[PDB]
C-alpha cells in the first residue's frame, strides 16, 4: 500500500486522538453555547479604521483603564435592516462567544447602545492575508500549504460543532505576530444540523449549490477552501470575471483551468475540492476530512505540529509596538454618532 | 482575463 505498517498504525492512532479531542471540544462548546453587556463605548479610545463594509466598520481601539488594544466591530442597527442581516448578527455574536481554537479570533466584549451593536475582539496586527498576497503576487506552494493546513484544522473543528463558516477569503484571514492565521468575521457562520437555504457569501467563493438555490450543507466550506488554495498559489481565484453574474456562470459550468506552474499534486487536490458533484467532493465523503488531510499535497504537513504552533512560519509581519497599524490599508474616517433615541430595540433584544 | 482585484464584499441575501 502507500504506507507501511509503522506509518499506517501511527496515522490510525492520530485519527482516534482527533476524535477524542473533538468530543471534548464539543462538550466545552455546548456549555458556553447554552450560557451566553460586558463593557461600554466610553471605556475605549477610538484610534483608526481597519476595514469597512456595508453595515459598519472595524476600528482599532484602546481600552482606557488597561491600555490594551482591541479590534472593535461597529454595526449600525438601522443598516442591519434586511431579515437575514439581523439573524446573521445574532449568529455571529453567539458563535464567537462559544468557540475556542488557536486560529479563531477571540471575542472579549460585546454591548449595544441606541444606535449600534459592538463586538470587541483581539487585535491581530499583522494585517489581512489579502494585502500581503496582492503585494507579493502569489505564495509558493509550501507557503500556501502552511496557511491551508490551518484552515483545514479550523473547519474540522467548526464542522464537528455543526457550524458552517460560509465566508472564507483572504480578506477575512489576519496574520498574527508569529505568522499564523486568525479567522475573523463570523457574520455568515451558522449552526446547521443538516441543510440550510440562505443565499449568502462572496461571489468568487460561492459553491455551485448555493448559486443554484439548493439547500446545502458544510461541503460549501470545502469548495471555498479549494478557491482559497487556488487563489493563494495563483494570485487570482479560479472563477474570475468583472461582474457577479459572469462569476456565477463560470462556477456552475464545472471547468477549472490551472497555471502551468501548479504541481500535479496541487491540481489533483483542487479538482477534488472544486467538484460540482457532491457525491465526489472531498470533505463530503465517507472518510470526511481525512481525504483532505491524507492527500499527497499535504504529505509533508505535521498536523499536530501545526495545531500546537510548533512549525516555523514562512512570513513574520513587521511590528513596531503596541497599536501599530502599519500592516493595514487606510480608510475614510467617519464620526461615531449615537442617537438620543433607541433604534430597533425589539429586533435586537437577544444581542 | 479580467476580474475583480480589490477587496470583495459579501452578499447577505442574493
Ligand atoms: N476582515 C477584516 N479585515 C481587517 C479586520 C480587522 C478586524 C476584524 C476583521 C477584519
Coordinates of C-alpha atoms and ligand atoms in Angstrom, one line a residue:
Chain A
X1 CA 0.0 0.0 0.0
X2 CA 1.1 3.7 0.1
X3 CA 2.0 3.4 3.8
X4 CA 4.0 0.7 5.6
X5 CA 2.9 -0.9 8.9
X6 CA 4.5 1.7 11.1
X7 CA 3.0 4.6 9.2
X8 CA -0.5 3.2 8.9
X9 CA -0.8 2.5 12.7
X10 CA 0.6 5.9 13.5
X11 CA -2.0 7.5 11.3
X12 CA -4.9 5.5 12.7
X13 CA -3.9 6.4 16.3
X14 CA -3.6 10.0 15.2
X15 CA -7.1 9.9 13.8
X16 CA -8.5 8.4 17.0
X17 CA -6.9 11.1 19.0
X18 CA -8.6 13.7 16.8
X19 CA -12.0 12.1 17.7
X20 CA -11.1 12.3 21.4
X21 CA -10.2 16.0 21.0
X22 CA -13.3 16.9 19.1
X23 CA -15.6 15.1 21.7
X24 CA -14.1 17.2 24.5
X25 CA -14.2 20.4 22.3
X26 CA -18.0 19.8 21.7
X27 CA -18.6 19.4 25.4
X28 CA -16.9 22.7 26.1
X29 CA -18.7 24.5 23.2
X30 CA -22.1 23.4 24.4
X31 CA -21.5 24.6 27.9
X32 CA -20.8 28.1 26.5
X33 CA -23.5 27.9 23.8
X34 CA -26.3 27.3 26.2
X35 CA -25.0 30.0 28.7
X36 CA -24.0 33.1 26.7
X37 CA -23.1 43.8 28.1
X38 CA -19.5 43.3 29.2
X39 CA -18.4 46.9 28.5
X40 CA -19.5 50.3 27.2
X41 CA -18.4 52.7 24.5
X42 CA -16.6 55.3 26.6
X43 CA -14.3 52.7 28.1
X44 CA -12.3 52.9 24.8
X45 CA -10.4 55.4 22.8
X46 CA -11.0 55.1 19.1
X47 CA -7.8 55.1 17.1
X48 CA -8.2 54.1 13.4
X49 CA -10.5 52.4 11.0
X50 CA -9.0 49.0 10.0
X51 CA -11.7 47.9 7.5
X52 CA -15.2 48.9 6.3
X53 CA -18.3 47.1 4.8
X54 CA -21.9 47.7 4.0
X55 CA -23.3 47.7 7.6
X56 CA -20.4 49.1 9.6
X57 CA -16.7 49.0 10.2
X58 CA -13.9 47.6 12.4
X59 CA -11.7 50.1 14.3
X60 CA -8.5 49.8 16.4
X61 CA -9.5 50.9 19.9
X62 CA -7.5 51.3 23.1
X63 CA -9.1 50.3 26.5
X64 CA -8.8 53.4 28.7
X65 CA -8.3 51.6 32.0
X66 CA -5.8 48.8 30.9
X67 CA -4.3 50.4 27.8
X68 CA -4.8 47.2 25.9
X69 CA -5.6 47.4 22.2
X70 CA -8.5 45.6 20.6
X71 CA -10.4 45.5 17.3
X72 CA -13.9 46.8 17.7
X73 CA -16.6 45.9 15.1
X74 CA -19.4 48.5 15.0
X75 CA -22.7 47.7 13.3
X76 CA -25.4 50.3 12.6
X77 CA -28.6 48.8 13.8
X78 CA -30.7 50.6 11.3
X79 CA -28.4 49.4 8.4
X80 CA -28.8 45.9 9.7
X81 CA -32.3 46.1 8.1
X82 CA -32.8 43.0 6.0
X83 CA -34.2 39.9 7.6
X84 CA -31.2 37.7 7.1
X85 CA -28.9 40.6 8.1
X86 CA -30.4 40.6 11.6
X87 CA -30.4 36.8 12.2
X88 CA -26.8 36.7 11.0
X89 CA -25.6 39.3 13.5
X90 CA -27.1 37.2 16.4
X91 CA -25.4 34.1 14.9
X92 CA -22.0 35.9 14.8
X93 CA -22.1 37.0 18.5
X94 CA -23.3 33.8 19.9
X95 CA -20.8 31.6 17.9
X96 CA -17.9 33.8 18.8
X97 CA -18.8 33.7 22.5
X98 CA -18.8 29.9 22.5
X99 CA -15.8 28.7 20.3
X100 CA -12.2 28.2 21.3
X101 CA -9.5 27.3 18.8
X102 CA -5.9 28.7 18.2
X103 CA -6.8 30.1 14.7
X104 CA -10.1 31.7 15.6
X105 CA -10.2 35.2 16.8
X106 CA -11.1 35.7 20.5
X107 CA -14.1 37.9 21.5
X108 CA -13.5 40.0 24.6
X109 CA -16.7 42.2 25.0
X110 CA -20.0 42.9 23.3
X111 CA -22.6 45.5 24.0
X112 CA -25.1 47.8 22.3
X113 CA -26.5 51.3 22.6
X114 CA -29.3 53.3 21.0
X115 CA -27.7 53.2 17.5
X116 CA -25.1 50.4 17.3
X117 CA -24.1 46.9 18.1
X118 CA -20.4 46.4 19.2
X119 CA -18.1 43.4 19.3
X120 CA -14.6 43.9 20.8
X121 CA -12.1 41.2 19.8
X122 CA -8.3 40.6 20.0
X123 CA -6.3 42.9 17.8
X124 CA -4.3 41.0 15.2
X125 CA -1.6 43.4 14.0
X126 CA 0.0 41.7 11.0
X127 CA -2.8 42.7 8.6
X128 CA -5.0 40.8 6.2
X129 CA -3.7 37.9 4.1
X130 CA -5.4 39.7 1.2
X131 CA -2.9 42.7 1.2
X132 CA 0.2 40.6 1.6
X133 CA -1.0 38.3 -1.3
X134 CA -1.8 41.2 -3.6
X135 CA 1.5 42.9 -2.8
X136 CA 3.7 39.8 -3.5
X137 CA 1.5 38.4 -6.3
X138 CA 1.3 34.7 -5.2
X139 CA 2.5 32.4 -2.5
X140 CA 4.8 29.5 -3.2
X141 CA 3.2 26.1 -2.7
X142 CA 4.8 25.4 0.8
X143 CA 3.7 28.9 1.9
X144 CA 0.1 28.4 0.7
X145 CA 0.1 24.9 2.2
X146 CA 1.1 26.2 5.7
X147 CA -2.0 28.5 5.7
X148 CA -4.3 25.9 4.1
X149 CA -3.4 23.4 6.9
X150 CA -4.7 25.9 9.5
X151 CA -8.0 26.4 7.6
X152 CA -8.4 22.6 7.3
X153 CA -8.0 22.2 11.1
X154 CA -10.3 25.1 11.8
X155 CA -13.0 23.8 9.5
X156 CA -12.6 20.3 11.1
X157 CA -13.2 21.9 14.5
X158 CA -16.2 24.1 13.4
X159 CA -17.9 21.3 11.4
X160 CA -17.7 18.9 14.4
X161 CA -19.8 21.5 16.3
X162 CA -22.3 21.6 13.4
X163 CA -21.0 25.1 12.5
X164 CA -20.7 26.2 8.8
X165 CA -18.4 29.3 8.2
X166 CA -19.6 30.5 4.8
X167 CA -17.2 33.4 4.1
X168 CA -13.7 32.1 3.6
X169 CA -11.5 34.5 1.6
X170 CA -8.1 36.3 2.1
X171 CA -9.8 39.5 3.3
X172 CA -11.1 37.6 6.4
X173 CA -7.8 35.9 7.4
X174 CA -5.4 38.0 9.5
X175 CA -1.8 37.2 10.2
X176 CA -0.6 37.3 13.8
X177 CA 2.8 38.1 15.3
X178 CA 4.0 34.5 14.9
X179 CA 2.9 34.4 11.2
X180 CA -0.1 32.1 11.9
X181 CA -3.7 32.7 10.7
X182 CA -6.6 34.2 12.7
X183 CA -10.0 33.7 11.1
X184 CA -12.2 36.7 11.7
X185 CA -15.7 37.8 10.5
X186 CA -18.2 35.2 11.7
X187 CA -21.0 37.3 10.1
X188 CA -22.1 34.4 7.9
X189 CA -21.4 31.5 10.3
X190 CA -24.3 29.4 11.4
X191 CA -25.2 26.2 13.4
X192 CA -26.7 23.8 10.9
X193 CA -27.6 20.2 11.8
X194 CA -28.2 19.2 8.1
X195 CA -29.2 21.7 5.3
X196 CA -29.7 25.4 5.2
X197 CA -31.0 27.7 2.4
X198 CA -29.8 31.3 2.7
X199 CA -28.2 32.7 -0.5
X200 CA -25.1 34.4 1.1
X201 CA -21.3 34.7 0.8
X202 CA -18.9 36.3 -1.6
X203 CA -19.3 35.7 -5.3
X204 CA -15.9 34.3 -6.2
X205 CA -16.1 31.8 -3.3
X206 CA -19.7 30.5 -3.6
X207 CA -20.2 26.8 -4.2
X208 CA -22.4 25.9 -7.2
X209 CA -25.3 24.6 -5.0
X210 CA -25.6 28.0 -3.3
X211 CA -25.8 29.8 -6.7
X212 CA -28.4 27.2 -7.9
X213 CA -30.7 27.9 -4.8
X214 CA -30.3 24.4 -3.5
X215 CA -30.4 23.5 0.2
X216 CA -26.8 23.0 1.1
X217 CA -24.5 21.8 3.9
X218 CA -21.0 22.1 5.3
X219 CA -19.5 20.9 2.0
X220 CA -19.7 24.6 0.7
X221 CA -16.8 25.3 3.1
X222 CA -14.7 22.6 1.4
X223 CA -15.4 24.1 -2.0
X224 CA -14.4 27.5 -0.7
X225 CA -11.1 26.0 0.6
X226 CA -10.4 24.9 -3.0
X227 CA -11.0 28.5 -4.2
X228 CA -8.7 29.9 -1.4
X229 CA -5.8 27.4 -2.1
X230 CA -6.1 28.2 -5.8
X231 CA -6.0 32.0 -5.2
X232 CA -3.1 31.7 -2.7
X233 CA -1.0 29.7 -5.2
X234 CA -2.0 31.5 -8.4
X235 CA -2.6 35.1 -7.2
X236 CA -6.2 35.1 -8.6
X237 CA -9.2 32.9 -8.0
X238 CA -10.3 30.1 -10.4
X239 CA -13.7 31.8 -11.4
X240 CA -12.7 35.4 -12.3
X241 CA -14.9 37.9 -14.0
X242 CA -15.8 41.6 -13.6
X243 CA -19.5 41.1 -12.7
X244 CA -21.1 38.6 -10.2
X245 CA -23.4 37.2 -12.9
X246 CA -20.4 36.2 -15.0
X247 CA -18.7 34.7 -12.0
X248 CA -21.7 32.6 -11.2
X249 CA -21.9 31.2 -14.8
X250 CA -18.2 30.1 -14.6
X251 CA -18.7 28.4 -11.2
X252 CA -21.7 26.3 -12.3
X253 CA -20.0 25.3 -15.6
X254 CA -17.6 22.8 -14.0
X255 CA -14.4 23.9 -16.0
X256 CA -11.4 24.9 -14.0
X257 CA -8.0 25.8 -15.6
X258 CA -4.7 25.8 -13.8
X259 CA -1.5 27.9 -14.1
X260 CA 1.3 25.8 -15.7
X261 CA 3.4 26.3 -12.6
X262 CA 0.9 24.3 -10.3
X263 CA 2.2 21.0 -9.3
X264 CA 0.2 17.9 -10.3
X265 CA -0.4 17.1 -6.7
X266 CA -1.9 20.6 -6.2
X267 CA -4.1 20.2 -9.3
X268 CA -5.4 16.8 -8.1
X269 CA -6.4 18.2 -4.7
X270 CA -8.1 21.2 -6.3
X271 CA -10.1 19.1 -8.8
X272 CA -11.5 17.1 -5.8
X273 CA -12.3 20.2 -3.8
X274 CA -13.7 22.2 -6.7
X275 CA -16.0 19.3 -7.5
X276 CA -19.6 20.2 -8.6
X277 CA -20.8 16.6 -7.8
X278 CA -21.4 16.5 -4.1
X279 CA -21.1 12.6 -4.1
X280 CA -17.5 13.2 -5.2
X281 CA -16.3 16.3 -3.3
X282 CA -13.5 15.9 -0.9
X283 CA -14.6 16.7 2.7
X284 CA -18.1 15.3 1.8
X285 CA -17.3 11.6 1.5
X286 CA -17.4 8.7 4.0
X287 CA -13.8 9.4 5.1
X288 CA -14.7 13.1 5.8
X289 CA -11.8 15.5 6.4
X290 CA -9.3 12.6 6.2
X291 CA -9.5 12.6 2.4
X292 CA -8.0 16.1 2.5
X293 CA -5.5 15.6 5.4
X294 CA -4.1 12.4 3.8
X295 CA -3.9 13.8 0.2
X296 CA -0.4 13.8 -1.3
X297 CA -0.2 17.6 -1.5
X298 CA -0.3 17.6 2.4
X299 CA 2.2 14.7 2.7
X300 CA 4.8 17.0 4.4
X301 CA 2.3 18.5 6.8
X302 CA 2.6 17.7 10.5
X303 CA -1.0 18.3 11.5
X304 CA -0.4 18.1 15.3
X305 CA 2.7 20.4 15.0
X306 CA 0.5 23.0 13.1
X307 CA -2.1 22.8 15.8
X308 CA 0.5 23.2 18.5
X309 CA 2.0 26.1 16.6
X310 CA 5.4 24.3 16.5
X311 CA 6.1 24.9 12.8
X312 CA 8.2 27.9 11.7
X313 CA 6.0 30.3 9.7
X314 CA 7.0 31.3 6.2
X315 CA 6.5 35.1 6.9
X316 CA 6.6 37.1 10.1
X317 CA 4.9 40.6 9.7
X318 CA 6.9 43.6 11.0
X319 CA 5.6 45.2 14.2
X320 CA 6.8 48.4 15.7
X321 CA 5.0 48.2 19.0
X322 CA 1.5 48.1 20.7
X323 CA -1.2 49.6 18.5
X324 CA 1.0 49.6 15.3
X325 CA -1.4 49.8 12.3
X326 CA 1.3 49.8 9.5
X327 CA 0.1 46.5 8.1
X328 CA -3.4 47.8 7.3
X329 CA -4.7 50.0 4.5
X330 CA -6.3 53.4 5.2
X331 CA -10.0 54.2 5.1
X332 CA -12.2 57.2 5.3
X333 CA -12.9 58.0 9.0
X334 CA -16.5 58.8 10.0
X335 CA -17.8 60.1 13.3
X336 CA -19.5 57.5 15.6
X337 CA -22.9 59.1 16.3
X338 CA -25.1 57.7 19.0
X339 CA -28.8 58.8 18.8
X340 CA -30.7 60.1 21.8
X341 CA -33.5 57.6 20.9
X342 CA -33.3 53.8 20.9
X343 CA -33.4 52.3 17.4
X344 CA -34.6 48.8 16.7
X345 CA -34.7 47.7 20.3
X346 CA -37.2 44.8 20.0
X347 CA -35.3 43.4 16.9
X348 CA -32.0 43.1 19.0
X349 CA -33.3 42.1 22.4
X350 CA -31.2 38.9 22.3
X351 CA -27.9 40.7 21.5
Chain B
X1 CA -8.7 37.5 -18.3
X2 CA -10.4 40.4 -16.4
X3 CA -11.7 40.1 -12.9
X4 CA -12.0 41.8 -9.6
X5 CA -8.6 42.6 -7.9
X6 CA -9.8 44.8 -5.0
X7 CA -11.5 43.7 -1.7
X8 CA -14.7 41.8 -2.4
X9 CA -17.9 42.4 -0.4
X10 CA -20.0 39.5 0.8
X11 CA -23.7 39.5 0.0
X12 CA -26.1 38.7 2.8
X13 CA -29.1 37.8 0.5
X14 CA -28.9 37.1 -3.2
Ligands
LIG1 N1 -11.9 41.2 7.8 C1 -11.1 42.1 8.4 N2 -10.2 42.9 7.8 C2 -9.5 43.7 8.8 C3 -10.1 43.3 10.1 C4 -9.8 43.6 11.4 C5 -10.5 43.1 12.5 C6 -11.6 42.2 12.2 C7 -11.9 41.9 10.9 C8 -11.1 42.4 9.8

